[PDB]
Amino acid sequence: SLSAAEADLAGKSWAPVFANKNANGLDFLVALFEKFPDSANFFADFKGKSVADIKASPKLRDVSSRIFTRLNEFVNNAANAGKMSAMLSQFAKEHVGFGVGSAQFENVRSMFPGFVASVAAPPAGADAAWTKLFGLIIDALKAAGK
C-alpha cells in the first residue's frame, strides 16, 4: 500500500482529473490507444477499429467511466493495505481472464504522469506516488499468472 502521505499526494493530483470524469475518462482511454495501439485489440468492442472510430463509438463512454470509477476507488483506498489486497486481487484476477498482462500495465504506468500533467501540474511527490500504485497493480498481475 502507499503511505498516508503518498496516498494524499496521489489524491491531490487526481482530484482535478476526476472533476471532469466524463471528458477526462474518454481522453485517457483515447491517449492509451494512441500511444500503445496494441491495447485496443484486447477490447471486444474496439478490436480492429481506428482511433477515430473509437472516438465516434457510443461504447466509449461506458468503458472509460468504468475505468475511472475503479481508479477512483484505488486512489481512495491506497493507504489501506487491507482494502488494497482485496481490490488488487480481484482486479488482477479479472484482467488476466480477459488476457491482459503486466506488460499492458507497464504501458499505462509509463504514460500516466504525462496524462495527469495534461490536466493540471501535479504536486511534488505525486508522480512517484502513482508509479508506486501502478507498481502494486503490476505485481498483482504477475501473481495472477501474467
* CB-based contacts of 20, cutoff 8 Å, min separation 6: none
Q: How many CB atoms lie within 10 A of CB 65?
A: 15
Is residue 104 a contact residue for ligand HEM (CB under 6 A)?
yes
8, 21, 27, 39: residue in contact with ligand HEM (rule CB under 6 A): 39
Is residue 115 a contact residue for ligand HEM (CB under 6 A)?
no
Is residue 59 a contact residue for ligand HEM (CB under 6 A)?
no
Least CB distance from residue 132 to ligand HEM, whole Å?
15
Least CB distance from residue 139 to ligand HEM, whole Å?
14
Is residue 67 a contact residue for ligand HEM (CB under 6 A)?
yes
3, 66, 82, 131: residue in contact with ligand HEM (rule CB under 6 A): 66
C-alpha to C-alpha distance for 66 and 63, rounded to whole angstroms: 5
Least CB distance from residue 72 to ligand HEM, whole Å?
9
Q: How many CB atoms lie within 10 A of CB 84?
A: 19
**104 among annotated binding-site residues:** no
C-alpha to C-alpha distance for 117 and 13, rounded to whole angstroms: 9
Measured between alpha carbons, how far is residue 25 from residues 18, 29, 76, 99, 115 in Å? 8, 6, 17, 22, 11
Is residue 133 a contact residue for ligand HEM (CB under 6 A)?
no
Is residue 70 a contact residue for ligand HEM (CB under 6 A)?
yes
- Give the SS3 label for residue 95: helix
- Provide the grid cell at 18: 476526476
Q: Which is nearer to ligand HEM, 55 or 70 (CB)?
A: 70
DSSP class of 37: G
Residues that bind ligand HEM (CB under 6 A): 39, 42-44, 66-67, 70-71, 95, 98, 100, 104, 108
